[PDB]
Amino acid sequence: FPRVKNWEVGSITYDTLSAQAQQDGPCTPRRCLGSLVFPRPEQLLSQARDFINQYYSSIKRSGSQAHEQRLQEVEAEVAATGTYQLRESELVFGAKQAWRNAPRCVGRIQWGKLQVFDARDCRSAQEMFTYICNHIKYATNRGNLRSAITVFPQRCPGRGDFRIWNSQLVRYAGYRQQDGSVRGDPANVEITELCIQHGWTPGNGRFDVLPLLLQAPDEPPELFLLPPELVLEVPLEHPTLEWFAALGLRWYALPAVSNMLLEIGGLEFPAAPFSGWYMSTEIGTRNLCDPHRYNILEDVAVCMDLDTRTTSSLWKDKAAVEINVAVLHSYQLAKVTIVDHHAATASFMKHLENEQKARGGCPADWAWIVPPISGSLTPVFHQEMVNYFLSPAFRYQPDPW
Amino acid sequence: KFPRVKNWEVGSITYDTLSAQAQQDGPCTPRRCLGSLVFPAPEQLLSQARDFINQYYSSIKRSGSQAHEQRLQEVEAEVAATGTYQLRESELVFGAKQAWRNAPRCVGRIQWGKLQVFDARDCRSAQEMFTYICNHIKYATNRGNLRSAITVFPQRCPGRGDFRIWNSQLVRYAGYRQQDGSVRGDPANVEITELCIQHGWTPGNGRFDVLPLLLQAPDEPPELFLLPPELVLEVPLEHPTLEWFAALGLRWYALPAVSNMLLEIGGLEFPAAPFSGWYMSTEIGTRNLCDPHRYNILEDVAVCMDLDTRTTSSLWKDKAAVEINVAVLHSYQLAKVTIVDHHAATASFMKHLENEQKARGGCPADWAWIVPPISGSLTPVFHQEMVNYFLSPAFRYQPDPW
Ligand code: HEM
Ligand code: HEM
Ligand SMILES: CCN(C)CCN1CCCc2cc(NC(=N)c3cccs3)ccc21
Ligand SMILES: CCN(C)CCN1CCCc2cc(NC(=N)c3cccs3)ccc21
Ligand SMILES: C[C@H](O)[C@H](O)[C@H]1CNc2nc(N)[nH]c(=O)c2N1
Ligand SMILES: C[C@H](O)[C@H](O)[C@H]1CNc2nc(N)[nH]c(=O)c2N1
Ligand SMILES: [Cl-]
Ligand SMILES: [Cl-]
Ligand SMILES: [Gd]
Ligand SMILES: [Gd]
Ligand SMILES: [Zn+2]
């Protein structure tokens, strides 16, 4: 039972929950691979039993009545068909547990508040688009963002798969050059090349919201233009740097992850987009200041008249902080839900104490919980953490080509 | 079948073949990663020594030669006759550099080849130990132009107790448990402060009181020694544009000299071998001054800056910590004392990673320690995957002598 210390306070806890880890991670006694982003048929019934048992434990209903009974239908269901369907409540309870189990999510204090749009009866690329559109409208909610996941049908053999080709529902274009250099978002240059190579007419500039390459089983994808009134965006301005708005920066309101594979009770949903709301450092520090992203750090520093000629003026640090200040200011003025890295990390500490008394620990990936600016100024920096894989869970999956 | 490692900023990909040589085992399993934890028979002495000698004769391109096999037999024979063996002076110098080279949480390893090794293995008392230590401080400080050095005291050996330095660093500030349960001075040093007093030290009552050295000779109680004030170079902290900052009265010392770690070379153990380089500014500005459990100045600085401290989304914490690091850098440059900022230091660590990949096929690195505690993704190490593992020779932690 791994001993875990908080170095700010001196408190000690043991992670007893770690003892139930499943799909093994990448580390061995001889080397640690915790800093790697992507680390490297009678079985369906075993993962199926375990999830059903997890369900009835939560609802105070282990050992009696329907506990026995639901174990049988999935037995018989896989006996005849080779797979099974989840009760709508299970799909809801599995959805929330997989969020609860995501080691890299700092927002999990919210895990109990989630809206599951059951789209298991989906049947075409036109059906998805409206299911995605109800999601985006429901989650955006005029800027009062609400956590939501939409679950499309569970993959089966013999036929294809529902898969959203974009990493997120809202992404910006990336246009190349004679010199290769990208106008727009360099992270999305690939999916931008597939969107043009499928019908879309490429826009002019930096923040062109990409279309949507949606793919119904077996058939090639179809482009879908997003309603410009459905894509809530926030123009970026700074509370006191008057020229900041003139930089013409923007970001969208809804972070909606549309390529991860949701896995409940052994069933694999390759299309199950979840959305929440942003922590401000994601937009201000990574999206805008990463060297391989919008890479605006130096442009902002010039406007602040900072001394970029020496690293020890800390001009990068100063410009980055104001970029974050502008993100937070802009989202609040637009009345769009956003959380700063200080409040977010402090709620995660509260989440860890919650998870300690409830489940005896919490899987957390320290490198992704600590925010990308001001890490030791947040409490999670001084908190030792244990990282492992529990089920149900979200997983990464190969790109569909 | 070797770990593939990606740099996300540039796209490059390498494989860490050196990790397969990992001479020991860390805390992680396929079940669970514990990488974020701060603290994770002659035959066996023989194979450790054998591996080091192999290493030493590889570095001098005498791999598998006459001298090489001579030394193997010599060591084999001396472990048989005495239970231990003795390092040659050149072996000791090579082993101390390799221990630095191998330290996975050190971001300054671009420097690992430039290390001054003082051989103190003939040391005989606590009083002589004090003289070697004072010479180390004087040489490494060098009036502000810092030089990396290590002084290596007699090795652990059967029949005799250990040489130990009780202090965690050669220069530390006292932490006096005030009567409110609070602390005046550095709270990380309350324990060693209590010990110095208990061992005869007359304590001061300032925030920046330099601790005496508690030096333990084999099978002897520790003995108190005061550092000559003019040996301890300090930097008063001022800010280039915030003139009230000087009125905080903050100081820090020039020489970071870690004195409580164990140096391991070829199975031999040196419980007392203090080493010193120079500071990266974030250690002082972010960790030592702003950690809530250290000097914890962040809020008092933000109030003085007139930041809005009632709400977190004003980023007052971030703004105040950035100005504290600016003051640290400005002050050390003013005083002409070596210091490196986290941008320069992480840039040079990327070059070390590239040197080490051509040289040994990889480099053991602890990502959570290499990425600075502010502005992480603004430095290139943030976007570099890393493989953490233990190679020997090595610096290791060891239990406190008391
Ligand atoms: C409600 C506010 C939320 C906030 C502020 C938040 C914040 C974050 C952040 C900053 C990350 C860092 C990962 C990255 O940037 O690539 C992350 C990871 C993640 N989040 Fe959340 N999140 C929220 C809600 C949710 C919800 C509703 C779900 C799903 C139901 C979710 C699932 C995940 C997953 C799967 C990851 C990646 C975990 C991994 O790769 O191991 N989050 N979150
Ligand atoms: C010359 C400039 C140097 C710089 C800028 C530097 C920088 C650093 C920093 C920032 C850390 C993390 C420590 C912390 O945050 O508490 C560290 C760790 C460390 N450094 Fe260096 N260092 C330097 C020289 C040296 C030398 C000369 C040695 C030994 C001969 C050394 C050995 C170590 C070790 C053993 C650790 C801890 C590694 C571990 O616990 O696994 N460093 N260094
Ligand atoms: C490709 C970029 N990285 C590697 C993965 C993208 N991703 C993976 C899933 C977690 C994640 C979270 C955010 N932000 C959020 N707050 C949320 C998105 C959805 C619910 S909350 C943004 C991106 C990602
Ligand atoms: C005990 C507290 N933690 C765990 C480690 C503190 N420590 C010991 C390990 C290395 C270390 C390095 C620095 N800084 C430096 N630049 C140096 C010190 C000596 C040469 S360079 C400061 C403190 C520490
Ligand atoms: C190499 C390193 O693991 C990589 O840059 C990680 C570090 N931590 C991160 N943390 C979050 N939240 N998001 C990221 O993309 C990353 N990138
Ligand atoms: C618990 C956590 O691992 C701990 O606070 C670590 C994180 N990274 C660090 N990195 C450095 N360089 N020094 C430290 O003391 C720490 N502390
Ligand atoms: Cl994003
Ligand atoms: Cl220090
Ligand atoms: Gd101007
Ligand atoms: Gd001023
Ligand atoms: Zn690990």
Plain-language structure description:
Two copies of one chain form a homodimer. Chain A is α+β, with helices and mostly antiparallel strands and 401 residues long. Chain A folds into three domains: 15-120 and 147-157 and 261-275 and 345-369, Alpha-Beta Complex (Nitric Oxide Synthase, Chain A, domain 1), CATH 3.90.340; 121-146 and 161-232 and 396-400, Alpha-Beta Complex (Nitric Oxide Synthase,Heme Domain, Chain A, domain 2); 233-255 and 278-343, Alpha-Beta Complex (Bovine Endothelial Nitric Oxide Synthase Heme Domain, Chain: A,domain 3), CATH 3.90.1230. Chain A contains ten helices and 19 strands. Chain A has helices at residues 44-58, 65-81, 88-100, 125-140, 189-196, 280-289, 297-303, 315-333, 341-359, 366-369, and strands at 3-5, 12-14, 115-118, 148-151, 163-164, 174-175, 183-184, 212-215, 222-224, 233-235, 250-252, 256-257, 261-264, 267-269, 274-275, 278-279, 338-339, 387-388, 393-395. The first copy, chain A, has a four-stranded mixed β-sheet, with helices on both faces. In chain A, a hairpin with a 2-residue loop joins β13 and β14. In chain A, α1 (44-58) runs antiparallel to α2, α6 (280-289) crosses α8 and α7 crosses α8. The radius of gyration of chain A is 23 Å and the shape is globular. β18 (387-388) of chain A pairs antiparallel with β3 (32-33) of chain B, so a sheet runs across the interface. It is classed as oxidoreductase. Keywords: Nitric oxide synthase inhibitor complex heme enzyme, oxidoreductase.
Write the topology of this structure.
Two copies of one chain form a homodimer.
Chain A: E1 3-5, E2 12-14, H1 44-58, H2 65-81, H3 88-100, E3 115-118, H4 125-140, E4 148-151, E5 163-164, E6 174-175, E7 183-184, H5 189-196, E8 212-215, E9 222-224, E10 233-235, E11 250-252, E12 256-257, E13 261-264, E14 267-269, E15 274-275, E16 278-279, H6 280-289, H7 297-303, H8 315-333, E17 338-339, H9 341-359, H10 366-369, E18 387-388, E19 393-395
Bound molecules: protoporphyrin IX containing FE (HEM) (2 copies), ligand 7R2 (2 copies), 5,6,7,8-tetrahydrobiopterin (2 copies), chloride ion (CL) (2 copies), gadolinium atom (GD) (2 copies) and zinc ion.
Binding site for heme b (chain B): 106, 397
Family (chain B): Belongs to the NOS family.
Protein name (chain B): Nitric oxide synthase 3
